Design a protein around this ligand. Structure first.
Ligand SMILES: OC[C@H]1O[C@@H]2O[C@H]3[C@H](O)[C@@H](O)[C@@H](O[C@H]4[C@H](O)[C@@H](O)[C@H](O[C@H]5[C@H](O)[C@@H](O)[C@@H](O[C@H]6[C@H](O)[C@@H](O)[C@@H](O[C@H]7[C@H](O)[C@@H](O)[C@@H](O[C@H]8[C@H](O)[C@@H](O)[C@@H](O[C@H]1[C@H](O)[C@@H]2O)O[C@@H]8CO)O[C@@H]7CO)O[C@@H]6CO)O[C@@H]5CO)O[C@@H]4CO)O[C@@H]3CO
Ligand SMILES: OC[C@H]1O[C@H]2O[C@H]3[C@H](O)[C@@H](O)[C@@H](O[C@H]4[C@H](O)[C@@H](O)[C@@H](O[C@H]5[C@H](O)[C@@H](O)[C@@H](O[C@H]6[C@H](O)[C@@H](O)[C@@H](O[C@H]7[C@H](O)[C@@H](O)[C@@H](O[C@H]8[C@H](O)[C@@H](O)[C@H](O[C@H]1[C@H](O)[C@H]2O)O[C@@H]8CO)O[C@@H]7CO)O[C@@H]6CO)O[C@@H]5CO)O[C@@H]4CO)O[C@@H]3CO
Ligand code: HEM
Ligand code: HEM
Lengths: 402, 402
């Protein structure tokens, strides 16, 4: 005897996150079955409170089963629980100190200018393809100290490892994934061996030299953690930049306020993060039977923490369906919460701030080419704008390197 | 000083309620300033809790100042406080017993089929002009026992008594209003006098005969209470019918459920009522200074109870932005709450159910002619659809009187 208006959905179907019906479905779930089971019985924590409770209780909600719903865990920190997680995190954190992040201000700002220079004379571009997508990848490659060509191979390997993991059933699809993993590891071990012998100041060198409680990372460990960073740092930042900007463009009074006053921008960045929630879910595995916010969960099953749904929880935000750059407080969970809280959160905030500040200054009349909805990427994990045609009065490039 | 995102609105401007921006503005109010002051300082209770608290405390929130923001009270029951109100109400209640309402089932049903008969062969109509608008006026005229021609005159007097009250600054406009009030009173007293002499079973007869605690209504009182019913019973019922049906038409699985099963219709009517909230506000006058849900209010000022805002209060409804005929419970305040709780609520529910049942049965494939938003009537008091083109497979008229 299900209810007439119960959403009939498959939360691992990428279309659910792209076709525009997600927020409606979440409203139904938060109001009627806050820990919701989809058409395949898959459990999902949909309220902010259920998400936080699960985040604060990794003893009961484990990450070691893997954070995707139909794959096992990988050997990197997001698929580990404390105490192993904490040590691995503290090791890798050497690369993400406040000082290491803040010292990238010049280089990231310089990248931002070159990307804008590439479109500013034209008076139109695709914001995704031409500004949002290149930026996070270029920051990563510069962080790793690699060439742009190397950066391109790496970020494509890491794409293919993502695809082949989510789909490895045919014997050819298995061999292809194993080949990709071999080529990834071989390239990355080579770079590591080089950094051991002739240190630089890049992330590889930092991981090689990191030491916590007498322990250091092995080469295999750096290979996996580097992978996690290639995967975790790229598309998410892209989608906040593009989806976040999209909302600024649709709220002209807010856009104008930000053009007139750059001190409003940190608050805007937090609203962009909440609104876009690029990571749609992370899984946890039940370590015991428990009744959780009304739903009986069994040991061994996975539950999806639905961060977008949490970030639109009216019981916490009051008016989450209104986009507001002045929202304060804004305790959104776009980066999760708790021991796994996004390691790259400060760097992501920096990239968003440095690029948006320059978008505001250099393209001050920016608008959507047309007000229709922006297409989103059908994906069940990280999703945001596929393309976003924009227009602006052209201006002359800065061409900093001359 | 004010927040960037604070709505800049005039709650007595009818365009606020028709241009589609109201629900967004209410979201901001409920979240940020539950007793909100508009751009002219006019106070408004926007949360369900603030509306219920005001309704339950008429000692502090009086109706005797008038229930409109810019007019004094009239001598009929909605502008009275208890004990005067209770007595007047109980007298008039003789016309609205369960028995009197239920004994209208055949006549209202017959009316409904006559209205559908006028469009069924054509395959299209304007649902406001041709179905929603005629019905509540015809029920009222039948209730009073008058001829259709008289009913038409009464309902036009009542309209422009409403218009002239709202605007009567200059001498010419004061004169038109006094002229209509005299013409209205003359006609109604004449009918009353006839009914005293030669009783029928209509509402005038029932009011003449009503006796509560040894007291009876005078002719002048029946004149005023009849005026209140002519105003109160007409456009409100229209807007729930047309706006309610509009939502059923836009949710095809719900429409299809109702066509298959008429037992879902009482729940549907309650959701139609909540969603459409045709009475957008009623005023109260403060009888003392008080700090109310955060806002300092002064004795003698008026506050608007924003019923639609209360009916979209997420803290109470969970998912009010999803239209759901299965919503249960559904304690909406479309009829208000408390001692003034709509006297016509059961007749209105009856008209809505009898007409909707016939629409479902006789026009089972009904649809909006196109999906664009339906124009709403700019008015600061009672508002809903101005027109609603619909289409359906034609059928043969019933032609009951043959
Ligand atoms: O229902 C109509 C018939 O009711 C007659 O008796 C009414 C009584 O009049 C009602 O008000 C009700 O209680 C009264 C209460 O006695 C009175 O204090 C109160 O307050 C009003 C105040 O007294 C007025 O001064 C008013 O301001 C008006 C102003 O004073 C005046 O100059 C007016 O212009 C009037 C005009 O002067 C007058 O001629 C009127 O025409 C009316 C007829 O003359 C009149 O006889 C009446 O019919 C009543 C029967 O005769 C019952 O005995 O209605 C005629 C119109 O149909 O024209 C203008 C008014 O039409 O301008 C000011 C307003 O125009 O201020 C207070 C109101 O704002 O009034 C209450 C009622 O509100 O007792 C009976 C029951 O209804
Ligand atoms: O899923 C784990 C599970 O794997 C099962 O299925 C695999 C099969 O085992 C494997 O052969 C695969 O095909 C691989 C091939 O045969 C390998 O030769 C490989 O080439 C390897 C090279 O052979 C190795 O040198 C290897 O280097 C690794 C290094 O020595 C070591 O430090 C390691 O780092 C990981 C740890 O070693 C390790 O503990 C690991 O945890 C694993 C456990 O040790 C396993 O017992 C557990 O069971 C195995 C089954 O026995 C096996 O049949 O699986 C655990 C999962 O991790 O994680 C550590 C992370 O730091 O790994 C170093 C490399 O980074 O790697 C090279 C890469 O070319 O090529 C194939 C894999 O690409 O066949 C099936 C699947 O088809
Ligand atoms: C807007 C951009 C980003 C978003 C929305 C985002 C979001 C998240 C989320 C939701 C988690 C899981 C936290 C949890 O389950 O509670 C996570 C973890 C993680 N992220 Fe990010 N991320 C972003 C950018 C980045 C960047 C730039 C990097 C690195 C360069 C990065 C690296 C990591 C790593 C290493 C983890 C694992 C931390 C752990 O398990 O302790 N992320 N992120
Ligand atoms: C959908 C149809 C209707 C709606 C939405 C509606 C709404 C309301 C509202 C909101 C109030 C004020 C309650 C308050 O302030 O707390 C009210 C009062 C009143 N209504 Fe209705 N109404 C409707 C239909 C009718 C009908 C058919 C009649 C019969 C003519 C009627 C007669 C009255 C009367 C006489 C009052 C004053 C009762 C009092 O002050 O005690 N209404 N209505």
């Amino acid at each position: 005897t299900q209810m007439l208006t119960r959403p009939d959905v498959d939360l691992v179907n990428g279309m659910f996150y792209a076709d525009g019906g997600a927020r409606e479905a979440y409203r139904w779930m938060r109001a009627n079955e806050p820990v919701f089971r989809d058409r395949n019985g898959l459990a999902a924590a949909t309220t902010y409170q259920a998400v936080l409770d699960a985040e604060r209780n990794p003893e009961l909600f484990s990450s070691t089963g893997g954070i995707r719903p139909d794959q096992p865990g990988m050997p990197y920190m997001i698929d580990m629980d404390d105490p192993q997680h904490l040590l691995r995190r503290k090791l890798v954190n050497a690369g993400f100190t406040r000082k290491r992040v803040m010292d990238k201000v010049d280089s990231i700002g310089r990248l931002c200018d070159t990307l804008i220079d590439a479109v500013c004379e034209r008076g139109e571009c695709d914001f995704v393809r031409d500004i949002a997508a290149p930026l996070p990848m270029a920051v990563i490659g510069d962080m790793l100290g690699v060439l742009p060509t190397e950066r391109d191979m790496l970020l494509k390997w890491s794409d293919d490892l993502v695809c082949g993991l989510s789909s490895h059933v045919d014997e050819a699809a298995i061999q292809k994934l194993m080949d990709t993993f071999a080529a990834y590891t071989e390239f990355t071990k080579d770079v590591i061996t080089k950094r051991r012998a002739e240190p630089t100041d890049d992330l590889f060198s930092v991981l090689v030299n990191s030491e916590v409680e007498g322990q250091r990372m092995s080469d295999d460990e750096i290979v996996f953690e580097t992978l996690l960073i290639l995967i975790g740092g790229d598309e998410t930042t892209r989608h906040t930049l593009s989806g976040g900007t999209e909302q600024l463009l649709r709220h002209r009074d807010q856009w104008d306020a930000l053009v007139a006053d750059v001190d409003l921008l940190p608050g805007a960045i937090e609203e962009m993060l909440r609104w876009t929630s690029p990571v749609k879910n992370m899984c946890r595995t039940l370590t015991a039977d428990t009744v959780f916010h009304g739903t009986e969960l069994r040991a061994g099953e996975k539950i999806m923490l639905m961060f977008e749904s949490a970030n639109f929880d009216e019981s916490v935000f009051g008016d989450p369906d209104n986009f507001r750059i002045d929202r304060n407080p804004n305790s959104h969970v776009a980066f999760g919460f708790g021991t796994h809280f996004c390691l790259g959160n400060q760097l992501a905030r920096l990239e968003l701030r440095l690029m948006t500040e320059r978008v505001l200054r250099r393209l001050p009349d920016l608008r959507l080419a047309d007000d229709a909805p922006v297409p989103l990427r059908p994906a069940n994990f990280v999703s945001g704008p596929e393309s976003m045609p924009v227009v602006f009065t052209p201006s002359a490039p800065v061409l900093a390197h001359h």
